[PDB]
Write a protein that binds this ligand. Structure first.
Ligand SMILES: Oc1cccc(-c2[nH]c(-c3ccccc3)nc2-c2ccncc2)c1
Ligand SMILES: Oc1cccc(-c2[nH]c(-c3ccccc3)nc2-c2ccncc2)c1
Length: 127
C-alpha cells in the first residue's frame, strides 16, 4: 500500500472570499491549535507508509489534517467558515474512527477538539 495524494488546497476554478470569520479561523484558531503541545500528529496528512498503518486509507476515505487546513485558509480556498469548520471536524472524527477509544492519539485529538470548540464559540459575527 501507498499514500493517496493530499487533499486539494488550491482551485483556480473555485470562487474566493475573504471574511472576518475566515480570517479568525486562520490567525486565531489554526494558529492556536498549531502551537498546542498535542498538535504535531495533526500537522500533516497521516503518512500511512512511514507509520506502518497500511489499513489507514482503507478505513479513512475523507482524510484531513491541519497542514491542509492551513493551506486552504492561506489560499482563500474556502467560501465560508462552515467549510473550514467541517474540515476540522472531519480531522477529529477520522482519528476517532480509526484509533481505539482511549488510545494516546485519541486523547490528544479530544483535547485539541475541546480547544477548537472553545475558539469556535468565540467566532465573530460575519461583518
Ligand atoms: O502507530 C501509531 C499509532 C497511533 C498513532 C500514530 C501516529 N504517529 C504519528 C506521528 C506524527 C508525526 C511524527 C511522528 C509520528 N501520527 C500518528 C497518527 C495516526 C493516526 N491518526 C493521526 C495521527 C502511530
Ligand atoms: O495518555 C496520553 C495522553 C496524551 C498524550 C500522550 C502521549 N503519548 C505519547 C507517545 C509518544 C511516543 C510513543 C508513544 C506515545 N506522547 C504523548 C504526549 C503527552 C504530552 N505531550 C505531548 C505528547 C499520552
Amino acid at each position: 500500500s501507498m499514500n493517496p495524494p493530499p487533499p486539494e488546497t488550491s482551485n483556480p476554478n473555485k470562487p474566493k472570499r475573504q471574511t472576518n470569520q475566515l480570517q479568525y479561523l486562520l490567525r486565531v484558531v489554526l494558529k492556536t491549535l498549531w502551537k498546542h503541545q498535542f498538535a504535531w500528529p495533526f500537522q500533516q496528512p497521516v503518512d500511512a507508509v512511514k507509520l506502518n498503518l497500511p489499513d489507514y486509507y482503507k478505513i479513512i476515505k475523507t482524510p484531513m489534517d491541519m497542514g491542509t487546513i492551513k493551506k486552504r485558509l492561506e489560499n482563500n480556498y474556502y467560501w465560508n467558515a462552515q467549510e473550514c469548520i467541517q474540515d476540522f471536524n472531519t480531522m477529529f472524527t477520522n482519528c476517532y474512527i480509526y484509533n481505539k477509544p482511549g488510545d494516546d492519539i485519541v486523547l490528544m485529538a479530544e483535547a485539541l477538539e475541546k480547544l477548537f470548540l472553545q475558539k469556535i464559540n468565540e467566532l465573530p459575527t460575519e461583518e
